[PDB]
Design a protein around this ligand. Structure first.
Ligand SMILES: CCNC(=O)c1ccc(S(N)(=O)=O)cc1
Ligand SMILES: [Zn+2]
Length: 257
């Protein structure tokens, strides 16, 4: 199976998922000196007031906080998007040490982690149909740096002990994802892909410029998770990030001057 180990990591994925070498793969490096301000981009509308989180799952590659997406509760609109995108899950990618972990980079800088809030375009009816479309998904990406603690992250880190290994889940209701956002919603955007197999080219990426700060203790708790299942040899869940892929024939646009 694919992973981020010594023998099944990102450089191997193309053998089962040839789109790994496609034309709109993610993540990418964001060159802040080449991305152009686009005055036609609108403010992002993040409407998370009615979000309903349900569960948190260790799926062997990350942990996903899952939401009820059976109605337009938590939605993303505006920005570069046409239409309404419903929040289905969020997860993170992170490193074995603070100097790596993000998927996107900014002028080659790697952040300690990156949060992905995954949304699907409701014009396609369900998530599985949305991932087959070039405008099916919108993923809001937020960098994490280590410094002050993020109060709104602590409920997530304190449940992690209960989902240490692959296939474990826990009830996770009433979690408010607004507590994971930075102050500013200035962003970069470009067309890309899922960053894990099947690597489908179905994503409008929206990457916030302002990182959130998390504490060393918070990220250390992500790094105590396991990729393996219960009872199997322990492999810490660290360095679950794909490195930057070729930009090819794409432009990265900035929402801000
Ligand atoms: C189809 C099963 N895979 C997913 O639904 C999926 C969602 C988001 C991302 S990411 N890392 O680009 O936000 C990758 C994969
Ligand atoms: Zn992701």
């Amino acid at each position: 199976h694919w992973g981020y180990g010594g023998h099944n990591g990102p450089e191997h994925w193309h053998k089962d998922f040839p789109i790994a070498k496609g034309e709109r793969q993610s993540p990418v490096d964001i060159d802040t000196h080449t991305a152009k301000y686009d005055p036609s981009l609108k403010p992002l509308s993040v409407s998370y007031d009615q979000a309903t989180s349900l569960r948190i799952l260790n799926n062997g590659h990350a942990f996903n906080v899952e939401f009820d997406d059976s109605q337009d509760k938590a939605v993303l609109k505006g920005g570069p998007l046409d239409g309404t995108y419903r929040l289905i899950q969020f997860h993170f990618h992170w490193g074995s040490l603070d100097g790596q972990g993000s998927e996107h980079t900014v002028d080659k800088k790697k952040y300690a982690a990156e949060l992905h809030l995954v949304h699907w375009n409701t014009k396609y009816g369900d998530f599985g149909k949305a991932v087959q479309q070039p405008d099916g998904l919108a993923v809001l990406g937020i960098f994490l740096k280590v410094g002050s603690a993020k109060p709104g992250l602590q409920k997530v880190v304190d449940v992690l002990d209960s989902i240490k290994t692959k296939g474990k889940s826990a009830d996770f209701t009433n979690f408010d994802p607004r507590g994971l956002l930075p102050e500013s919603l200035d962003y970069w955007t470009y067309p890309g892909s899922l960053t894990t197999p099947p690597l489908l080219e179905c994503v409008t990426w929206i990457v916030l410029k302002e990182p959130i700060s998390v504490s060393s203790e918070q990220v250390l708790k992500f790094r105590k998770l396991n990729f393996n299942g219960e009872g199997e040899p322990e492999e810490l869940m660290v360095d679950n990030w794909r490195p930057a892929q070729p930009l090819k024939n794409r432009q990265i646009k900035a929402s801000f001057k």
